[PDB]
Design a protein around this ligand. Sequence first.
Ligand SMILES: COC(=O)N[C@H](C(=O)NN(CCC[C@@]1(O)Cc2ccc(cc2)C/C=C\CNC(=O)[C@H](C(C)C)NC1=O)Cc1ccc(-c2cccnc2)cc1)C(C)(C)C
Ligand SMILES: [Cl-]
Ligand SMILES: [Cl-]
Ligand SMILES: [Cl-]
Lengths: 99, 99
Amino acid sequence: PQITLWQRPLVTIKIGGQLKEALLDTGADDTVLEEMSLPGRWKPKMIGGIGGFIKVRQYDQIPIEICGHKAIGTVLVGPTPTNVIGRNLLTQIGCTLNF
Amino acid sequence: PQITLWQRPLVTIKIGGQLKEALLDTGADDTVLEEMSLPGRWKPKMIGGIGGFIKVRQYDQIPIEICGHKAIGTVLVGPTPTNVIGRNLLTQIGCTLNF
Ligand SMILES: COC(=O)N[C@H](C(=O)NN(CCC[C@@]1(O)Cc2ccc(cc2)C/C=C\CNC(=O)[C@H](C(C)C)NC1=O)Cc1ccc(-c2cccnc2)cc1)C(C)(C)C
Ligand SMILES: [Cl-]
Ligand SMILES: [Cl-]
Ligand SMILES: [Cl-]
């Protein structure tokens, strides 16, 4: 698709068999989702946003569909204000910025 | 141009007679820059991101140039860790997400 930016670029993702809404965020290195359960072991990460830092749980090699496009990669889980899809997954689904 | 997302999408902006580097951020409602002077009226605003909120000054009808594309819009100024170009200006230079 081609997504214009007059509204928030909110898309449906699927992760762990569940649908969620998330924001396609080219300003984010990483993908960070609201509290949820994921399988396997997690590692610590501290990520910084415009308001400061939060601690998150890092899960690797997680399957996630984004607008129907299949990706498998790192998903952080923590107290984010919204679900954000960052460049780590945007690159997997072939996203670019164009003007 | 077509801008890849392997790296952070940083560009040069011209604003208030100054050249600055900033991040093209499809996930950001607003454009927010580190402390700088701008002409004209302003009013305070709280904006939120990962980590919570910061207080910024809101300047309206500010001319900006982004990759040689001229636009005008609201620019927020305050203690953001990094300069962000948000959707309010990305629309004006015809920026889209494509995959
Ligand atoms: C490499 O770090 C990151 O990639 N951080 C990212 C990040 O915060 N990146 N930002 C871009 C802004 C992200 C976000 O779009 C993320 C976001 C957050 C909330 C919402 C949408 C999108 C919805 C709620 C309110 C609307 N808020 C916003 O639209 C704000 C804008 C006002 C700025 N939008 C955002 O904050 C830019 C950013 C980059 C680095 C830092 C940073 C650097 C050094 C020390 N501390 C922080 C801070 C901000 C993460 C999402 C992974 C935390
Ligand atoms: Cl990844
Ligand atoms: Cl505006
Ligand atoms: Cl348009």
